[PDB]
Design a protein around this ligand. Structure first.
Ligand code: HEM
Ligand code: 0I1
Length: 436
């Protein structure tokens, strides 16, 4: 008699689609196997509210092992995403929060604008209606160049075709996370890629420390606060865990969200005409979007919320259930990982009418707000520290694309998903482009 046997469950697609099928068939508490562990997927809004909105429930560290270390190489270690002890998390969260204040983020608008403008100019030169362009690749290069400058004061210049070894290292590390949760050459390429990313942190931290000593210019950035959180530490391993955490987390989900949005909008010509009209009316001929302009792009804000409902790059989270608890009529044993999924809840007709329809008007003013059914940045104390940074950067990039260019998805390109650390388009989002 297995400890989970009594829980309801089974006797371009991802595992999350299988979980969706099972939540619909077996109800709000279902036993699954994920990251090699038995867990329970909990899909009632009452459960999302109870477990995400209380500091009583902490993240289940077992479900973060493949971010902490891959194939025996330390990756994110005990950085801000993967630290599951409340007190150790809270200390670093409150120091790093200062880099995400309103004043800190408004000062990044110049960087967001400059990299968005550079992308647009590169794309405008290819806008012949014939040359295929990977929007997944171009949006990833743009997100990387933004993050490296905004967070670290470094110029990666991926939009100029630079840092190819770094681009390969990130790709192989993301494949390593995926393989670890589900040979000789794979192990070697993944392990060397993780060590490369930590050595980039060593190199960049040494550059920052030399700049501070020589009395050169250093703007207050995320790296300032990562350093501050480690003041008086025994070694640099905590520093490098947060360096790699922010270097990867600060670009990959943003790129995924951009690529999903461009992909979906390629089959939504009326919505695109509305977004083009909105950018035309709000920013006009301006080459630079001001902070005050972002809040005026209200239809774009709704489109991006709807993109996250259907295509959340980070599908959810886990909490550790410490004691046996009744969850929606089901007895869940103590020491169980509870899986929460914004991907699954977003596709359930219980929670969203016509869930596969892309309808920005779900997020219109005076529309009833989703109540614990929608959480692409999670909820509660472990919600995304980067949520407003991401929302600002992606609005800037999308507004500049919409101002200047028309995109058509190359026929044959698919709308399917893949999972490698995060959810992202299976295909490269190959488009042809024309100037507006
Ligand atoms: C559209 C883009 C993004 C999405 C969808 C997203 C999503 C999420 C989600 C779902 C979580 C909770 C993860 C968990 O419970 O294990 C999270 C946490 C986090 N994200 Fe993001 N994120 C985005 C952008 C960013 C950016 C831009 C940064 C950094 C600049 C970032 C850094 C982090 C960190 C460090 C955490 C851990 C926060 C904590 O536990 O205190 N994210 N994000
Ligand atoms: O692994 C994950 C998530 C992966 C996405 N995370 C991010 C959050 N915000 C920005 N970026 C990321 C990022 C991107 C690339 C990456 F390799 C790791 C992290 C949050 C954690 N778990 C949640 C549990 F179910 C296990």
């Amino acid at each position: 008699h297995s400890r989970y046997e009594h829980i309801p469950g089974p006797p371009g697609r991802v595992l999350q689609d299988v979980f969706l099928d099972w939540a619909k068939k077996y109800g709000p508490v279902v036993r699954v196997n994920v990251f090699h562990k038995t867990s329970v997927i909990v899909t009632s809004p009452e459960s999302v509210k109870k477990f995400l909105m209380s500091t009583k429930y902490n993240k289940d560290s077992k479900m973060y092992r493949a971010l902490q270390t891959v194939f025996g190489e330390r990756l994110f270690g005990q950085g801000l995403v993967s630290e599951c002890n409340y007190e150790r998390w809270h200390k670093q969260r409150r120091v790093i929060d200062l880099a995400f204040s309103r004043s800190s983020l408004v000062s990044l608008m110049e960087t967001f604008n400059e990299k968005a403008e550079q992308l647009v100019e590169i794309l405008e030169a290819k806008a012949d209606g014939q040359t295929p362009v990977s929007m997944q690749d171009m949006l990833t290069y743009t997100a990387m160049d933004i993050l490296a400058k905004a967070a670290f004061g470094m110029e990666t210049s991926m939009l100029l075709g630079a840092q190819k070894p770094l681009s390969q290292a990130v790709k192989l590390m993301l494949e390593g996370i995926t393989a670890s949760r589900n040979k000789r050459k794979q192990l070697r390429e993944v392990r060397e890629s993780i060590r490369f990313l930590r050595q980039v942190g060593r190199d960049w931290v040494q550059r920052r420390r030399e700049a501070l000593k020589r009395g050169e210019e250093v703007p207050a950035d995320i790296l300032t606060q990562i350093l501050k959180a480690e003041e008086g530490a025994q070694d640099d391993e905590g520093l490098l865990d947060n360096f790699v955490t922010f270097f990867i987390a600060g670009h990959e989900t943003s790129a995924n969200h951009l690529a999903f949005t461009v992909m979906e909008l390629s089959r939504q010509p009326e919505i695109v005409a509305r977004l083009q009209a909105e950018v035309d009316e709000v920013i006009g001929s301006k080459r630079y979007l001001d902070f005050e302009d972002l809040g005026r792009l209200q239809y774009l804000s709704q489109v991006l919320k709807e993109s996250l409902r259907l295509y959340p790059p980070a599908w959810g989270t886990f909490r550790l259930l410490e004691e046996e608890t009744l969850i929606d009529g089901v007895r869940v044993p103590g020491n169980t990982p509870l899986l929460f999924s914004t991907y699954v809840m977003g596709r359930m007709d219980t929670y969203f009418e016509d869930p596969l329809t892309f309808n920005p008007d779900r997020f219109g003013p005076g529309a009833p707000k989703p109540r614990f059914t929608y959480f692409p940045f999670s909820l509660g104390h472990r919600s995304c520290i980067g949520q407003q940074f991401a929302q600002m950067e992606v609005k800037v990039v999308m507004a500049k694309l919409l101002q200047r260019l028309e995109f058509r998805l190359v026929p044959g390109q698919r709308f399917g998903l893949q999972e490698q650390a995060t959810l992202k388009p299976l295909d490269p989002v190959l488009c042809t482009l024309r100037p507006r």
